[PDB]
Amino acid sequence: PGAFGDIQATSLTSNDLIANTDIRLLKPSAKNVHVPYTQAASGFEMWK
Amino acid sequence: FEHATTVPNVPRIPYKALVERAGYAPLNLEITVMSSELIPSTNLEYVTCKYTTVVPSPKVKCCGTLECSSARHADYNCKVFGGVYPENSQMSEAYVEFSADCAADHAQAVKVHTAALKAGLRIVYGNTTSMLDVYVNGVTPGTSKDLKVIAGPISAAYTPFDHKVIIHKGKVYNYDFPEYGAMKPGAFGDIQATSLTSNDLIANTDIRLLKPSAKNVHVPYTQAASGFEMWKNNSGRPLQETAPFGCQIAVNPLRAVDCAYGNIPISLDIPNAAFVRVSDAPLVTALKCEVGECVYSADFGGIATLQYSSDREGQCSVHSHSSTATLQESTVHVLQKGGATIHFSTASPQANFIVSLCGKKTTCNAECKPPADHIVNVPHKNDQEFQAAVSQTSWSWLFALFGGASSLLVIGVMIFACSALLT
Amino acid sequence: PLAHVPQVVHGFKHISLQLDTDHLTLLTTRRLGEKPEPTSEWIIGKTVRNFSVGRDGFEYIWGNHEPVRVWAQESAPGDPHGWPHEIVQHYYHRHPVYTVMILVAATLAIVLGVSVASVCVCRARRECLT
Ligand SMILES: CCCCCCCCCCCCCCCCCC
């Protein structure tokens, strides 16, 4: 994660996507309904 | 009965000991230090904030003159500038005071003397636990319901603090604030005050009044930043985050909670109705020990099996006698024929220790293997030792090499005596 | 804000923690021994930090989470129960300021013993031979 090649697919339209992103869900704690998370950045953008 | 040992001061590591007197079954004893803080005796010199200088509406005579001296206030610069506002005169006195709010954001330049030690000891003896708290000086008896505990003087005294300290909102800084009444401007301690509410501010502020030049009435002053405001930028890391034994510092009375240093000597005074005679403890004959895993160094890397033979169904009480292994759970519900297990916890490559089940002492010989886990959430429950952290095979190699480096010398001095006394 | 929980790699006598944020967080450490040796830094972006943990080691915190403590163990590559090329790889890799010392002392003891034996047996062939 956080490097080049985080998402992977064998064409632009094929299935079987493959992904590490260090996504971590978190416990909601608020008055209204939300689903919180945290995540590593897009490692294709950190190559450009 | 009276027993005396030396607990090590690392909090929430339990410590096993047997107390045994004659004609009585040896009962167990665990003494876990659950909290420990040293409290020093403190007294505060002064109190600082930012000035919000009273910048009053100035005093201006159109044709008359002003000669304004000082009222009982702080730093002024009660300066009386001449020909201005086209003689006329303005006596501007921008005197400092406290800010609009120091009940929320101030500082307490506290001085600190030598400190104490409490503890929060939890002692389990027999079937009863006891929560107490005892001053770590060799005299004061912290007592439970029935046992009297004293705790000796510390091996080596230690302070995370220093002589001079500063308390901000919540945090603590080892900084060298200037004395009372002898301050310098620009730095910390411009305003001094013995409290928030009292009178008698003493200021050296580097306030500088300037002669006005404008079409309208104002009063121009320049100043440095308040030394409090500039200390809020110049300060490094509090003592919460650089304290030298992992201790954490919470302050209403400025204590240093949960240090880890030295070792307390305890000296307990056990009641007399917890013991039980050997005419009521089960006997035990003929122990043996298979020894299993023995991954050393970690937490509880050891298994063994005690193979025993008793008379009744009671509870015995297990304790390792050497120091290079320290077991766990300290009591065993034995039976007549049985084999219940233990948990050695060495930190040396030779499990070579001595176990007594209910009084019958046997040994455990083994060989320990290094762990395959590099970094772990739990502190070490032993300390290393020379002549015990060196494996047996390496002793065989060292004695072989260094003793073969000397047996030929013994043969050489026999050559001396033989060749010199026969001739 | 709570920062994005880092990712640790436990080596021999150190940790390495890949960190990835985008607003500046504050990484603070200390060692829990006698010499604390503190360290503080602001980081952005994506970086990797290495920190040598000892036997009494290393509490780090990172960007207003609760702190986290870490203790190191006495691993090494080798065995103290084996051939002499597997034991010295276990001790010199853990205490290099002792292993070389005892090796030098042992070899000098061998050289001393064989030298005095070699000179005294030649003395014995001399003085017992008129
Ligand atoms: C700080 C306390 C010291 C306790 C550990 C001391 C370890 C000494 C280790 C010396 C290494 C001896 C290895 C020698 C191997 C001989 C094989 C020929």
Numbering used by the authors:
A (entry chain a): 197 to 244
B (entry chain Z): 1 to 86, 99 to 435
C (entry chain d): 234 to 363
Paper's wording?
Alphaviruses are enveloped, single-stranded RNA viruses with a diameter of ~700 Å. The T = 4 icosahedral symmetry alphaviruses comprises 80 trimer, including 60 quasi-three-fold symmetry trimers as well as 20 icosahedral three-fold symmetry trimers. Each trimer is composed of three E1/E2 heterodimers. The E2 protein is responsible for host cell receptor recognition.
The resolutions of the envelope glycoprotein and capsid core were determined to 3.5 and 4.7 Å by gold standard Fourier Shell Correlations (FSC), respectively. The atomic model of the glycoproteins was built ab-initially. Our analysis showed that in each E1–E2–E3 molecule, four N-linked glycosylation sites are present, namely N139, N245 on E1, N283 on E2 and N14 on E3. Two types of trimer-trimer interactions, the interactions between a quasi-three-fold trimer and an icosahedral three-fold trimer (type I) and the interactions between two neighboring quasi-three-fold trimers (type II), are observed in this structure. The interactions exhibit a quasi-two-fold symmetry with the third region located at the quasi-two-fold axis. This region is mainly formed by the interactions between two completely conserved histidines (E1 H125) from the adjacent trimers. Above the kink region, a hydrophobic pocket is formed by E2 subdomain D, E1 and E2 TM helices. The interactions include several hydrogen bonds centered on a crucial hydrogen bond between the side chains of E2 H314 of the subdomain D loop and E1 S403 of the E1 TM. A candidate of the pocket factor is the hydrophobic phospholipid tail, which is fitted well into the linear density.
